[PDB]
Design a protein around this nucleic acid. Sequence first.
RNA 1: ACCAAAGCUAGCUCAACAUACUAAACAAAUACAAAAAUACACCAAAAUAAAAUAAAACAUUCACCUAACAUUAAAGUAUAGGAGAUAGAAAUUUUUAUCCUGACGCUAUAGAGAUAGUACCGUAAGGGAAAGAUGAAAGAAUAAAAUAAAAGUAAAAAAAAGCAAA
RNA 2: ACGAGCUACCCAUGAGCAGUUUAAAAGAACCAACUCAUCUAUGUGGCAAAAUAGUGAGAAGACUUGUAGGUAGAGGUGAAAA
RNA 3: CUCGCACACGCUUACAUCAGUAACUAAUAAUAUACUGAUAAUUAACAACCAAUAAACCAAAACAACACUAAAACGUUUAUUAA
RNA 4: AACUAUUCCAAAAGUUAAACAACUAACUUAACAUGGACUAGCAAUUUCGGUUGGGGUGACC
Lengths: 244, 98, 95, 240, 122, 75
Amino acid sequence: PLHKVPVGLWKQLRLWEGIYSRLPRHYLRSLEEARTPTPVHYRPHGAKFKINPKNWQRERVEDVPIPVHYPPESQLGLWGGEGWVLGHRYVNNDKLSKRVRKVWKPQLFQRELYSEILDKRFTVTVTMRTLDLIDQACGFDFYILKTPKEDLCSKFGMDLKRGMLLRLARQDPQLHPDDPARRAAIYDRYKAFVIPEAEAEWVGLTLDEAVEKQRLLEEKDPIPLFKIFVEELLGQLQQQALSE
Amino acid sequence: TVIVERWWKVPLAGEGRKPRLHRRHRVYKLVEDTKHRPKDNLELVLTQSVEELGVRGDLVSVKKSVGRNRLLPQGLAVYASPENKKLFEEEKLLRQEG
Amino acid sequence: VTYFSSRKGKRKTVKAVIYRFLRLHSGLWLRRKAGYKKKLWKKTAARKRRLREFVFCNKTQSKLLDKMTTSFWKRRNWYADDPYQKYQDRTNLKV
Amino acid sequence: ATSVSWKSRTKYTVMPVKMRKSGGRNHTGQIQVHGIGGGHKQRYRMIDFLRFRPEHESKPGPFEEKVIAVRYDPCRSADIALVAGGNRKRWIIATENMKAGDTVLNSDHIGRMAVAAREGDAHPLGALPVGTLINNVESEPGRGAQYIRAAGTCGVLLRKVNGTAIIQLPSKRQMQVLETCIATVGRVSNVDHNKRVIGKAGRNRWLGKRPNSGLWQRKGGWAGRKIRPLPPMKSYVKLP
Amino acid sequence: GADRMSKWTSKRGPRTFCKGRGAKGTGFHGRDGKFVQIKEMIPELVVPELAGFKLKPYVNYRAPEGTDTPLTAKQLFLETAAPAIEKDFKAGTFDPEHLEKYGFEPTQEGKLFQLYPKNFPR
Amino acid sequence: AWRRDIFGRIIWHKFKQWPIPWYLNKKYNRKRFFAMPYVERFVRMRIEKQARIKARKRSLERKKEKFLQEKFPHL
RNA sequence: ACCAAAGCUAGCUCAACAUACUAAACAAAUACAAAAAUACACCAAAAUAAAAUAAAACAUUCACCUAACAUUAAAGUAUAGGAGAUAGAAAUUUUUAUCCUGACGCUAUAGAGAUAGUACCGUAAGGGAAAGAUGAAAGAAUAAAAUAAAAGUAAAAAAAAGCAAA
RNA sequence: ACGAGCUACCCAUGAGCAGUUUAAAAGAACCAACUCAUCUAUGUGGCAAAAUAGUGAGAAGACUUGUAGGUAGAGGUGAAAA
RNA sequence: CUCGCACACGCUUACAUCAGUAACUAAUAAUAUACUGAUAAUUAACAACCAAUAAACCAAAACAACACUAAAACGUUUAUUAA
RNA sequence: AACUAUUCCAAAAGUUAAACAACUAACUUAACAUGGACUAGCAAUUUCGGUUGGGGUGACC
Ligand SMILES: [Mg+2]
Ligand SMILES: [Mg+2]
Ligand SMILES: [Mg+2]
Ligand SMILES: [Mg+2]
Ligand SMILES: [Mg+2]
Ligand SMILES: [Mg+2]
Ligand SMILES: [Mg+2]
Ligand SMILES: [Mg+2]
Ligand SMILES: [Mg+2]
Ligand SMILES: [Mg+2]
Ligand SMILES: [Mg+2]
Ligand SMILES: [Mg+2]
Ligand SMILES: [Mg+2]
Ligand SMILES: [Mg+2]
Ligand SMILES: [Mg+2]
Ligand SMILES: [Mg+2]
Ligand SMILES: [Mg+2]
Ligand SMILES: [Mg+2]
Ligand SMILES: [Mg+2]
Ligand SMILES: [Mg+2]
Ligand SMILES: [Mg+2]
Ligand SMILES: [Mg+2]
Ligand SMILES: [Mg+2]
Ligand SMILES: [Mg+2]
Ligand SMILES: [Mg+2]
Ligand SMILES: [Mg+2]
Ligand SMILES: [Mg+2]
Ligand SMILES: [Mg+2]
Ligand SMILES: [Mg+2]
Ligand SMILES: [Mg+2]
Ligand SMILES: [Mg+2]
Ligand SMILES: [Mg+2]
Ligand SMILES: [Mg+2]
Ligand SMILES: [Mg+2]
Ligand SMILES: [Mg+2]
Ligand SMILES: [Mg+2]
Ligand SMILES: [Mg+2]
Ligand SMILES: [Mg+2]
Ligand SMILES: [Mg+2]
Ligand SMILES: [Mg+2]
Ligand SMILES: [Mg+2]
């Protein structure tokens, strides 16, 4: 016999039933759409169409991402959207030579970075690509607000972002307690990214953490039947009092 | 960062279908190592006067080692960004005044 | 030869044929002679000519090539400017 | 699976402590070192290898200890001596002629006049004469003794340059150290340990030594008599 | 080939294997190694005087059964709290804040036998 | 509580009374209520197996009706 | 005349539909040596599938091979390949509802392994059976009723000479 | 994936070795228990998928042995007999 | 004619009493510790379960006087709390 | 190939002169540790052409 719905859709229809239904819509819409991550290891060709060199004919051409592995320790730092390339290689690059398994590993560095909005120095493992992206986006906090989830690739990056996004939507006074000058000054330049509060606490969440959170907002000790029966009784007694 | 390219051409799937991959599409040739490129420079705007490099309110080009690990942590410089640039446009206009 | 393909279940063509032979529509196959670019200084001009020819294959070879080649290659082709369009019909054949 | 090492006891005791041999196996259980196992059962005596160790941090000065008894040790080739002063006892490695009912000085104090060296004496290197025999030699000051502990071994103090001592290890290699490091003066106990004759294979087994393999290996290029110029001098002196 | 299927029991193992049959522990091991019983952990049977009362283990056959109505939270609310509540709302003395006079209990942790975590066996 | 055990079954876990709170408890801490990823495969199998059984129970009942209808055609 | 022989049921197979997809049953006990109410902790984790095989050997290669996108064509075409074996697209095209669900599928050596993952066999992972037939009634057993047909025997040992018959 | 309850080697923790000879508990000697397995005959679908009868070697040691643990197949372990 | 009584480990009712055995177990019988049924049964003093943290203790077991070398398993007491 | 050690270039952190002559370079390296090479160890994959008055040796193709 057959499953009525394809198994590929069993993950999706898992999210249409049960507690996942009661999750905030903006969050589910942030998980739904998977935007193609910025090319990192493979280098993309710009054109859609390319003239075949051998053939002399106009050829349709597509860009296929190269699978990259992210060890879990990459989720503790920020590696700049990159990771391990697991693959094979020919020796000497002659197609006729041996074919050999090969893995290319990113070069990692211990670097401490300063977050303005979070007023803190974090000791983080980053790549040279991360530093170039921070450089290019002109600030640490900039790089973290200005980059999509798929491009950071870190749970830690997403938690940093959740944090300073909250600090922006709240206008948290505890940022710089003594100097409202510094405070307004900093909260000023980042005014482009400011989002409401209901959105800001759901940004960097894994589906697990989300389901937990929603389970805790929904936590209620079932109401004693004495209450409900008392209210039914007061309803009936007030309708017996108002009819005469 | 290693930049890598496929030895075997991948067929097309054009409608938005995901490409159908074989094991032979896992064989890569190494086209570049970014770390081995001749390295670029970093452009900054100094907020104080550095010994060798220059004055407060100056536009300087250094090597990224010196800029990342000395100047920017110590608040001796800021990035070349436009919003940070207009500040020193104004500073240059109100300096030469008095 | 693949008689039933994996994806389509159709019958594949052996491309190694399609590069060295030519099928007229009559069923005759046409081929180059072997070794015609090889060691020319060492050969007679007569032999060289015999080599520069385009020649026809015997029945057995023809049937073999037809089996190794799908239907598409046996279709009637009208090419503009085609050298060989002159030769694709057969004439005055009493058998 | 996983085994825990027996080597956990935090507080120092003169009392013999019980220990578990493991023939050549690492903590995973695989054989790392071949040919070890099943000796006689042994207790272990904790040895204090820092010879200058002021009892209380209150009185820092050079102190003196009495040698109570000199005992055999199963764990090391040298013979060891029980040494008591103040309220405290410790096991130290015994110098050659050290005997029971004895007096032994432990001092960190250098001086311009050096010192007349007895046996049990522990002094900083800079405080000794330049021909002296030393054992239990520290590397970095405050570290504790590592070098020249084996039975009947002695190194020699060679010279003193630039607030630094240069000594000669029993392998006849030279070692450069600060002159602030402590050493004991003399040859280590039990000098005839060299000439001991193991009579029978059984005796070897008593020492926890399992026989060599039976496999026949042809000798390689590594084999022969290699005559190498003696190695350069090790310096534990960290230059600025 | 041993025995897989037959259930594991104290009769089966070595000397060192002692596994109770499921009676409940009445105490702890004390100082001397001797065992100490805690008078509180030993169930105290509460038995009424049966002698002066008339009921029997069986019932007369011609005695009727009845229409079977399972007790519901509602019926119990109507036999107890409803007369008192109606009496004090009709009199205007009803206080939605404190219902405790009607027998409602806000929290269970004060009283001896609690209903929800269920402090008593039977 | 409704929990998911090692085997991926959705189980009703009754609670137990302890003198110490749950994070300080060795023995309880070494139970796992959650499944690892491999378990997901087995879960699927379970479903399918179940589905089969139901599927051919249904077909049986259907069959039994037809037989009877040609044995007792009083309709 | 013995040994035997015959049933037609148990259920199964393949699809359709379908809601949606870990059944049933939970009082206690169950992750101490599972089924043992009760004491200060720890807890947890990921790395490319490989090869048999095809190439008449074997070394690059070798569809499918536990990753949703179907259907009609384009097309076994463009391309890719020790340019060998083989592999192989796309642009672009086509697809009209819902009911009429069943059977030129099996019938106890078949159909599920299944009366059962049981017995039994393995230390363990694991392997894994066989077996049913009276009648409306057996609350009709001095019991009544239709095959007596396999090999094996009995009823009934053998009598010169020979592929055993012609 | 599963296997070191057999066997190889280890780790913990226990247990055995009587008589005789010797200044001696000396990998000495005689000889039991104990441990092995020399030589022959039985046996060869056997009592037994390696035994029986005799006969032999060691027998305070590199000895035998119980219990609980360890090392795992690209491995382990090995007084090498693959 | 002489491998006996007990315990550990392991087996799990194969043990006990009464009855039955045409056939089933015993490599045959007789009958029964082993097949069948019914009914019972091993009772704790033995055994398992049965404290932590500090602190003084260098000093073998060998009839232990005292030693040998291969350097050796096995606890007292004092303090602090121990339902 | 991987892995284990070696050696080197690059990456990464640095450091010096304001360099020399007349009228930018050079050097540094604690533990980790990346990319690309080198030399070994330990290894991985695969194969033993045919004819032959049997095969082998010899001979031959
Ligand atoms: Mg030792
Ligand atoms: Mg010694
Ligand atoms: Mg040797
Ligand atoms: Mg040898
Ligand atoms: Mg079994
Ligand atoms: Mg027991
Ligand atoms: Mg027992
Ligand atoms: Mg008692
Ligand atoms: Mg092949
Ligand atoms: Mg073949
Ligand atoms: Mg082959
Ligand atoms: Mg394959
Ligand atoms: Mg090519
Ligand atoms: Mg070929
Ligand atoms: Mg298409
Ligand atoms: Mg069947
Ligand atoms: Mg079957
Ligand atoms: Mg017959
Ligand atoms: Mg005849
Ligand atoms: Mg064992
Ligand atoms: Mg004796
Ligand atoms: Mg002897
Ligand atoms: Mg014998
Ligand atoms: Mg005889
Ligand atoms: Mg004998
Ligand atoms: Mg003898
Ligand atoms: Mg002898
Ligand atoms: Mg074990
Ligand atoms: Mg192999
Ligand atoms: Mg091996
Ligand atoms: Mg050999
Ligand atoms: Mg049995
Ligand atoms: Mg009986
Ligand atoms: Mg019998
Ligand atoms: Mg090889
Ligand atoms: Mg291969
Ligand atoms: Mg040959
Ligand atoms: Mg041949
Ligand atoms: Mg010949
Ligand atoms: Mg011949
Ligand atoms: Mg030859």
